[PDB]
Design a binder for this molecule. Sequence first.
Ligand SMILES: CC(=O)N[C@@H](CO)C(=O)O
Ligand SMILES: CC(=O)N[C@@H](CO)C(=O)O
Ligand SMILES: CC(=O)N[C@@H](CO)C(=O)O
Ligand SMILES: CC(=O)N[C@@H](CO)C(=O)O
Lengths: 324, 324, 324, 324
Amino acid sequence: MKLQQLRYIVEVVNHNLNVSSTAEGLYTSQPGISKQVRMLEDELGIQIFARSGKHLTQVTPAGQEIIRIAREVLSKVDAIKSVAGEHTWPDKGSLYVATTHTQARYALPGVIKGFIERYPRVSLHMHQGSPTQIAEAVSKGNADFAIATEALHLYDDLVMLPCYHWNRSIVVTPEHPLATKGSVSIEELAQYPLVTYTFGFTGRSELDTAFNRAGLTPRIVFTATDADVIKTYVRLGLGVGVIASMAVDPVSDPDLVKLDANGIFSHSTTKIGFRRSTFLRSYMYDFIQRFAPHLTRDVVDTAVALRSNEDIEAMFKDIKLPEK
Amino acid sequence: MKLQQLRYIVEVVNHNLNVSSTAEGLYTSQPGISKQVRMLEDELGIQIFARSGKHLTQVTPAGQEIIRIAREVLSKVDAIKSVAGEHTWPDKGSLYVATTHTQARYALPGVIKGFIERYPRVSLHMHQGSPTQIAEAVSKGNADFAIATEALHLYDDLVMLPCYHWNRSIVVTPEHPLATKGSVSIEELAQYPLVTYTFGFTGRSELDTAFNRAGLTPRIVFTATDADVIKTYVRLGLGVGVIASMAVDPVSDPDLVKLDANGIFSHSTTKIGFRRSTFLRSYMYDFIQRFAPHLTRDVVDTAVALRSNEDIEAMFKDIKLPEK
Amino acid sequence: MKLQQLRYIVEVVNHNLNVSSTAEGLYTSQPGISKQVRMLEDELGIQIFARSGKHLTQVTPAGQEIIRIAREVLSKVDAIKSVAGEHTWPDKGSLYVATTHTQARYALPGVIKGFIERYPRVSLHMHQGSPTQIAEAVSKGNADFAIATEALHLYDDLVMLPCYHWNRSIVVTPEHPLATKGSVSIEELAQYPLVTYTFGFTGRSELDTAFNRAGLTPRIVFTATDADVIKTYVRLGLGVGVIASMAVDPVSDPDLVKLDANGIFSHSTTKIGFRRSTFLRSYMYDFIQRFAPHLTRDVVDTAVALRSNEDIEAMFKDIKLPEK
Amino acid sequence: MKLQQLRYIVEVVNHNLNVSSTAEGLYTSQPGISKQVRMLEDELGIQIFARSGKHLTQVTPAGQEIIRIAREVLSKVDAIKSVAGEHTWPDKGSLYVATTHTQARYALPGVIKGFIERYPRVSLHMHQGSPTQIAEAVSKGNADFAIATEALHLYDDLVMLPCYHWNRSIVVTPEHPLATKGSVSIEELAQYPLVTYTFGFTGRSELDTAFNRAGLTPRIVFTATDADVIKTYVRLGLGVGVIASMAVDPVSDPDLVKLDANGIFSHSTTKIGFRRSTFLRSYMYDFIQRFAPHLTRDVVDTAVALRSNEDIEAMFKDIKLPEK
Ligand SMILES: CC(=O)N[C@@H](CO)C(=O)O
Ligand SMILES: CC(=O)N[C@@H](CO)C(=O)O
Ligand SMILES: CC(=O)N[C@@H](CO)C(=O)O
Ligand SMILES: CC(=O)N[C@@H](CO)C(=O)O
């Protein structure tokens, strides 16, 4: 059987079993349609249409099942023609970034807007987590780059490019002693229980440094991996949150009070990192540059070319980067 | 767009994108085929196949939507012929079943006798194979019905009807250590070399779960698709076998000891199913019922009407299926 | 054999067979580690690690049997500290929980508040992550409890306890073609580009299952680990989000519209669990009951003494769990 | 704490609080046991025993629980020592073969047996299937070696080495008409229902070639993949079996009558085969040579270097093959 035979038997039913009438619709003759039908009835071995002399009187019970299915065939044929083009698929390559929740939320939905306009068929996948995790993803090859925020010693064995410098903040509820205060000392901060990052205190961080030169041990009551959680816990108890400054601003967090700790802890440096051996696709260079405007392709090449991260440190040394 | 064109692109895929194989198989010429494909690719304005040179390397994304509808179309045309034959000679046709070696030997002979009694003019064709091979057989047209014994995820696109639950045994020769301990733990078993199915360990079977659970790795010295192969292996060496209980008889197999493993591996479930597109002739319902007494015509038509195989399981929540 | 040696070979697997990483992380010398490890292979007569030069390529098969037991040893040693801690001062200690961003933000504040009130001397620590990352957190010993939301096969080696069932919503901008259709089939959805978790599509998820059932492949333009990041992506573009209903509120998020997907994807079960080796302290039973009311002290110890997580689900058949 | 302390507290209860008996039994001093136990008591910050003067009187409530775990801890340290050596794994490489049931079980039990002993740490994997499935297994890369029995045109583009030559028998129940017929004829056979392989009649097989050149068209009532399954069914009615003669003998199949059919159908050739790019190992060359003694290492290698499949058959022209 052929598609054409199927069209014909569905059209003959559309046009009242008026075989003459059918043919006008479809630019052919009565002994043409009539021939293809009689052929199919012979192939299948059963009559689709009961017949009084020459006139067709009605569709047979077998007839009716067959026409019903033939309508489906036709429906599915048209469906084939309707299939979307290859343009509708994100199959031109994919970018896997490992970073933090703050990196993903704040720095990045102005960059990612910009990147998806430039590359509509390139899929993007943001992994989250601790520094340990962000590092493991790149080196195990389950992510192409890390945007690293701290504990940069774990991204030894990658290539690491400076993006910007960042500073932490003491966030408290509006009710809190600290909320209306000429700044805050390290000793004042060691007084209240701390809500910080899981990896906030490790033994070697900027938080451990500050508490260790002052001889204070801090009381840690709650920790979590992402700032959102920390802020959210800071609607509960005399606890004092320490998080990145760029993870709280007064527009979107008015139940909350950002206070300076730049005196108290040293700055951290966000870097974008990847494996020596990684082919840098066009969209890889575009992402790097959007996120951090000074890392153009010429700049990224100059740095991959150097012997190690020691030298890359010597490259940027006297370059002033943004604070965020 | 011609039906012969949808047969070609489908058959190409059924033959690993090898077009010379496709031709041998369909008794037509390679140029003819490649030609039809290039015309359809042109009519639709959509590359279906990625190409290297002359070679076809893969099915493109848009390409897959096309192939999927094409298979539908083709199975509908088969449905027409099938409907014509029911109305012409109800008791005359052929039944194509894919299932395992064990089902063919231990679940079905009894049923197949009684079926052939009832339907002398219905030719029965039983493909043996792995779960994957069974799924393949229906996917590729060689099989109206599948009796799945496990790895039921491989059939999410079929209607699948529960038949019975079944449990595995440990099988050794009577001179084996484990013969006269007659109370085996997962920890005891994992010492020994294992002789099981090729698809026994797949990452997600019940054997997988039981070892993962106890944190062990199996020692696999030998596998086979077929339980009879496994058993005649076990008659030589120091392997321990893990096969369906119903595959070992105290009568037929008294050189093999059969140990209990209900308290190690969870039971599997056998199901019988078919593409939703498949016209169910009266002899089909018979067969189903003779295999699984609770799968009456009503029950089967009710099941088919539902939308998931999970909803079909909801239908049998208050009924406790046989244990084999 | 020494405890210190077992910590070394296990913390070595933990840092991906990387010995100077193991060193840095445990404030100690690298050869100290190498010499302990060679000593243990010596003492056991078994190579635990494949070697090349002075490089560690993989864990040997008999080597893995040894690590798996080591991990047990150490986690039992930590129990002895915990039994001591309990008997000395019970209301004091720490609790490490690994779960998802969505459970930390939308299921736990109110359980956490209640908990910190009762146990001000118990520091609480919430790891966020993928289902993979949660299993890992308990495996490595950085977590006492897991609160898993899907992919429960990843915790077959844990006592897992059902808490509640949850569902997915399709989320879109209030001007997307889908908002005023109120009526989405999987076919309609599959047209669109998808935004969803990094672990949305894995081959065996509930998302995978709906698509395989309908023969369709999803268009995936962006994934994130974190449901919030998905949410703010969906506030920009053309793509449709697929996330837990409970990550989207009419008042939390009025800029997003939340469409029924109950009839597309099957529900998932949230569960809470922990290594069998873990000693359960008084605040731990407490944490568990505060999260899942039906999970009482008696219930938990009953669930522990069973043998699998299916048998544990068996216990809550004659009881409908909350839906979320 | 140290394993030694845990051994000590454990061992002290075994010797019923007698430190002296302890020292004798573990070959150590009383002062050193007593010191190590105080040490653990300090570390843990709790007493594990009560004291009368200097002797030891009773165990504490916490002690009771610490000892419980201690025993467990020790028992696991034992299990490390008892781990089976690197020899008990079959991890020296594995051998995957795609062939038929017949081949597996009537040619190979004796060829495997010999291959196993020589290579006890080489795992052996026996995929079954139809000719078309056997060829895929290899080309795809789920098996190294196919032992093909017929329709050798599917294994073009693989290296195929002739092994031997085989013919078919008619097979019947002792109650069948042909059971005691002086010979049997292409016409007599055709008048009967036929029971044969699924791929028995293809359009171009030795069964087609025979029935086609006599203008007979056969009735086929049942087909299966395996000969074993073909044999079983032939306890029914009027059906005639057509299978390989090597898969039936009167001693182990006395229920059936093996009646000759060399007049009716020409012989096929069994061949063993692999992909060109396959790196042949030693246990590879061995299995080949145990299966077909003419296929020595040097012959295989000559064959693989040759130009076409053409020449390969010509290499065996003057070499008479076994007949089975
Ligand atoms: C600036 C930044 O993103 N910092 C991390 C913390 O290192 C964060 O997750 O907030
Ligand atoms: C019950 C059954 O047939 N089980 C399969 C294994 O999945 C077999 O072939 O033995
Ligand atoms: C209910 C829940 O927490 N869902 C997970 C996904 O399983 C999430 O991270 O949103
Ligand atoms: C001789 C042989 O093995 N023949 C196959 C069929 O070609 C069989 O399975 O019996």
